[PDB]
Design a protein around this ligand. Sequence first.
Ligand SMILES: *CCCCCCC(=O)N(O)CCC(=O)O
Ligand SMILES: [Fe+3]
Ligand SMILES: [Zn+2]
Lengths: 94, 93, 120, 97, 78, 77, 455, 107, 108
Amino acid sequence: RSRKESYSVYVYKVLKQVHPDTGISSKAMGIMNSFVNDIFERIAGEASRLAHYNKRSTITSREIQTAVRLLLPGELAKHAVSEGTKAVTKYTSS
Amino acid sequence: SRKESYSVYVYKVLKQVHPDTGISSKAMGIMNSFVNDIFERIAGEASRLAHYNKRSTITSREIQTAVRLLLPGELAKHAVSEGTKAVTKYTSS
Amino acid sequence: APRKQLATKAARCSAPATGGVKKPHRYRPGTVALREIRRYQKSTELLIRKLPFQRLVREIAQDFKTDLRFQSSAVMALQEASEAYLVGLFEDTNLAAIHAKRVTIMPKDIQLARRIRGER
Amino acid sequence: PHRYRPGTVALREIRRYQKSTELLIRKLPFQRLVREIAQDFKTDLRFQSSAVMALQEASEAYLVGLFEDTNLAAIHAKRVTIMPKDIQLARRIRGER
Amino acid sequence: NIQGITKPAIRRLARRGGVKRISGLIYEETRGVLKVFLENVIRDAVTYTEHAKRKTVTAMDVVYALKRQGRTLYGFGG
Amino acid sequence: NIQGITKPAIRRLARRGGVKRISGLIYEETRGVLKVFLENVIRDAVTYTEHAKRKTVTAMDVVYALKRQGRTLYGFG
Amino acid sequence: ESYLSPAQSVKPKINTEEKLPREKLNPPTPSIYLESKRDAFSPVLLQFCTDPRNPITVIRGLAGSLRLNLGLFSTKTLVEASGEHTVEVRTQVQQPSDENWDLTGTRQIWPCESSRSHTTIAKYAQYQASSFQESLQNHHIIKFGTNIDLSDAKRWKPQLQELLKLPAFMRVTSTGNMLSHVGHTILGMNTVQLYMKVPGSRTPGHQENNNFCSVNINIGPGDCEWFAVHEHYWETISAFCDRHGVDYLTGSWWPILDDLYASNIPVYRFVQRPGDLVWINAGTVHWVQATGWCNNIAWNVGPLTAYQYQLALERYEWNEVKNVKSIVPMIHVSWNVARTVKISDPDLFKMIKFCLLQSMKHCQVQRESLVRAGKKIAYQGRVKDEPAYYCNECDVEVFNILFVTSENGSRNTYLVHCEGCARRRSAGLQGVVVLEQYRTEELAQAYDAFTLAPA
Amino acid sequence: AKAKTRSSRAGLQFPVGRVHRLLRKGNYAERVGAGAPVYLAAVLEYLTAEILELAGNAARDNKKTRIIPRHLQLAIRNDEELNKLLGKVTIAQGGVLPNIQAVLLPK
Amino acid sequence: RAKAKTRSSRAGLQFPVGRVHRLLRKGNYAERVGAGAPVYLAAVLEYLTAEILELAGNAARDNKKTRIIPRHLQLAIRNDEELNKLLGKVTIAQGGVLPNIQAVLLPK
DNA sequence: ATCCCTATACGCGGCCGCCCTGGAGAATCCCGGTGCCGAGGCCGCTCAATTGGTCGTAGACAGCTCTAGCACCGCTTAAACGCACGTACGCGCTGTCCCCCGCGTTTTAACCGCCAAGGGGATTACTCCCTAGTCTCCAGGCACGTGTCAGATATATACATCCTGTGCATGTATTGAACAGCGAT
DNA sequence: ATCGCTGTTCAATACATGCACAGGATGTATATATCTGACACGTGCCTGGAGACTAGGGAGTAATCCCCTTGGCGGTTAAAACGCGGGGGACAGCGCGTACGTGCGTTTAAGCGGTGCTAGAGCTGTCTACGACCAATTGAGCGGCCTCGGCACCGGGATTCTCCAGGGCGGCCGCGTATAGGGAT
Ligand SMILES: *CCCCCCC(=O)N(O)CCC(=O)O
Ligand SMILES: [Fe+3]
Ligand SMILES: [Zn+2]
């Protein structure tokens, strides 16, 4: 009856981007959905704490970037920050 | 500007449990940090409880459940008793 | 120089045991253990029986709330968590045993691995 | 020449340092180490005195706890001396390596 | 009912954990450790379930109780 | 400069921890462990301060970094 | 090699191809009593036990009068005399009396159930006690206690200590028992052995290895059915050994009256009772069944009596040519006996003389063709109570000279070689040390020392 | 109109009003119940009073009036419940509990 | 109005910028959410998913399989060091363990 | 001036040795075969994201103060360093005894398929109770200033403790004595 | 029987640890004395909490469905349980030499007190863009469906490691050996 949203629709698109001839099982898809939800929660909570520390009431791209710097480990942090900056530039430009 | 701390109330509780004992400044800072820590813990757990059940308010139920989930056993029992008594007295007045 | 260490089997007298039914082939103690290690380190299936685990879970939960029904996925998740926890604990216990210059993991190894991890 | 047998002054020091709360590291060398470590991340950083004190307190707590765990790791292997392998085991079993 | 977790099952768990030789007394200790862990997680899950005014422990309750203990689990829900 | 944590300092820390005998190779190990711990904590604190568009590393930044790593520190706010 | 021929033989001769009625095929066997120590100790009783006329004699109540604490041999105080030890047991099926049928359930085949097994002593004690009272008050299975070592007198001190109030020849070993003179402790041969069993327990028929005389005391409370046969009919077994396929030596088989009935072998059927004693004469192939929960104290001795030695050496020769394992070195035993015994009979005099001369001759030839062409002829010296060294590629006894080298072994253990196997080794011998413990001069001196006292 | 602090109404010493304001401005939920601040303040006061009683006993056991961080550390690390609630917390100037492994005590 | 262009397309992403904005607004993390927070968060999540899925696909191909099961995800996570650090305190249900035997346990 | 005669350089040939090499046999893997069920693409819909415009305030910017972070000096002395000595402790080797492992056999209960009931989770619907918001009034608690007494530092003292050189006491590594087995006379 | 010899079985003797036990240095717990600066209080006021009313949406309660959780039955099939034999490993014990603890002398630099400069944290006022809010719209993603290939089970042969032999070519050991020339007669 009532709907249940999930990141499977976009996870499969990302998979088709990476491996254009590979699939994914249902259990693996659930694992990936849980991973996406967990990382979202971590980053969002860290950004909220960052905004609360500095007496801000809005979460901006800077808060997300600093949360990514704090959470992701080493090289992954740099790559994710670069991707996010490029995405925001593309979004604002267009 | 004007800071806020629990030092004013931590000293009342002290006087209600050890009338002739004082507290230093480092110790008072430790007590204030401890109160802040426990407040953050309980509030976050209650917020998670409210969000999980597809609700949008935090009430005595959520606070009691968070106290049960975070406090270890006997502390939890006594804290729940005291909180329920406090809410009862507050409502009665 | 003087050897004087010549030796042989010791004599004995016994009622005949005809037939001599015996099993000669045996693996040395340890090789099959390594085989089991390899076999279970390349699989993903659970190593505990489901029904006994469900019975234990219900027996434990009986002390918290009565008439507590369990979703099947709930018990499956509990089993997965418990077995992963035990596998990690056993890895740390084996590390402690190897630290102590032994190969046999003993209860003291488990106790040390739990104390260091902060789990009382 | 009254000489104490080995290990008798060690226990006295253990008792003396467990009864106390003072910071065991000299403040100036620790401050210099903190500044040197920070200069790699950001340049021309200024540290509050309270920040350096908090860093030193946290470092002392971490090292004391690690030494307790390493002492446990040493006693299990039938030894009174702690060594680098004991510390490495305490760190591995701790999930920080 | 803790005897359901048998010696062969504990041997399989240890083998997956990389253990080669297993002491005789380790099985009882493992049973106690498993019982302690299960008690903690099940108590948290039952608290979660009681909050929702329910009577069946859902997979989400177990996942939340585990994440509360510092043992996040993937593949049984959010 | 890392050598500023002298051998007597590490011996005092071990004594407080309970160690009775100390090997000769443990001082270098302790220096490495302390360097790694301080590096992680200081990187977290410097990121925290840099977010606030500041040049001074406040005691609150260190406390937040410690809370984030998993070492909650009382007595500094 | 050959050490025996038709020159020394006291062995009475009868032909297996004989005819026997039921009386001769089932006659009561000579039996006696004992009313004093002097009876058994007197030469009359000992000779009766060394007498070819009687296949076996019963000393009824011998312990019943002297009252030695054979009840201390009881498995009760045995457990209160041992908690942990080895008790070899032969698993067997509980057939009633003499009905050891087969799978089809209506045949009596010669082959019998005889399977090895062992565990802790207390395990067998528990099993036998429980199966007792018929397992807390045919169809049944029965573990069979056999050859339980008793070579130590410490844990069994009352037993062995009280087991000396009898004559030397009926004693474990003494100057009247050649087993003392072998310098060894042959298990189940020269040191008494106790074997517990349940009702129906069966030790398949056999002749005691080397054909010694046997001293058997069922301390009970169990009883025993018996089937004694004199030595003449021994090859008779072999006869039906071919007919029913079983073998006469080291095999497994429980005869039946008709089985050897075509052999016309009589059957000295009788029994004993708690506390009794019996002398199974050397050469008596006997098959026993403990029809009740019991425990035997049995061992083997040979009095210097002439008949004993000749009735015995036949088995030694058999084994030598049958590659069959023996349990007593006659060569070495003949030496120490001919070296430190009051040999006072011409019969046994020449009897030993012949094979001793053959031993001298073969050792002579061995060293002669192999002294320098041999390999470092060594002089070990034969330290006192050296265990008799037996080959392993053939098992034959190695006397004086021998071929022993550390055959690898991380602990460097030593293996023994004889001339017969030196062959499989290589041309003559090439690789194994030679160690002879008696110079020909010393052995010749001992030979000269051998004399017939005028006793 | 007659003012009355909600702490007095509930019988508490900790501030119900301040706790309510913190719960409202800390972004925990869209709404905050009337009894939630009272319950949370009562629990906080209970925990504070328990640890304070333990610390005062520890300090008096040392012949001192003022409570310092060492007494707080002793109270937290001695009692098992408080030790478990604060098992991953470092108290500044708290020190360590006095213990020595018996294996190290002189033979 | 004009042809509605999904916010994800403008950001050049494949994760839902609008859905991430919805979750941020309804998750009571902050009083207000900037226009750039959803885009940044969606891009970061998509990058992390791409990394994990590329490693898992390589692991699956090594195994001679077309689909991806949780075992392949566990292998990919526990091999890469940074991913293992990020997900160090996680357990993948039905994933198993990384094969390893202490060098001393090997037969002498 | 000649006999000597056994320890010394010589040898060679046994001696162990340490790996190599072979079959035999349980393991596990890979190729070919068949079949099922779940993942993947399609379809209908509905509700959530987009568009488009307005309102209010949150944060960005400029200006400005007064805090405290840094840097200096000059000295006291407290602690770190280096060295010499010895001891006890970590580490290797050896020995034993025993307790886990590999295996076979009995049994037992986990598991799969299917049936069947109903308890409770999940949803929709209606109603009101409660929480956010707004305004105003005023009380508590925060910053600042003061004094006084608890705790730190010092001294001199009496005491607890550890290290070493005394003694007795005792069960045992090591003696004579008291049993005898044992035999030719 | 006995005048000798003999193996056992008992007691008696000597010796080094367990432990008192003195002294005596050394470090420690203590008790009175003194003074500092941090706590505990008071003062004013001013930002935040409380009183009062509104207005609206979240939550509570009920009614209903139907999913799925439990209860059960039978047979089949692997997995558990029990017992056995044996070797490999845990534990102890002894040797040793090496590296760490202790104490003392030398001296490096941290702690401390001032003292001044200024870089920046922190406050205040302005206003401007940007995020929330709302109405209308449609097309993105979700719930079902169907289907067809990837994977799962199966069988049968192909390596392939284990695990015992059996040696074959390098080592040292050690027995043997030849002796002969400096010493002694
Ligand atoms: C060599 C093993 C047997 C020793 C001789 C006794 C024997 O064989 N028994 O069957 C004992 C029967 C008896 O006489 O008690
Ligand atoms: Fe016989
Ligand atoms: Zn031979």
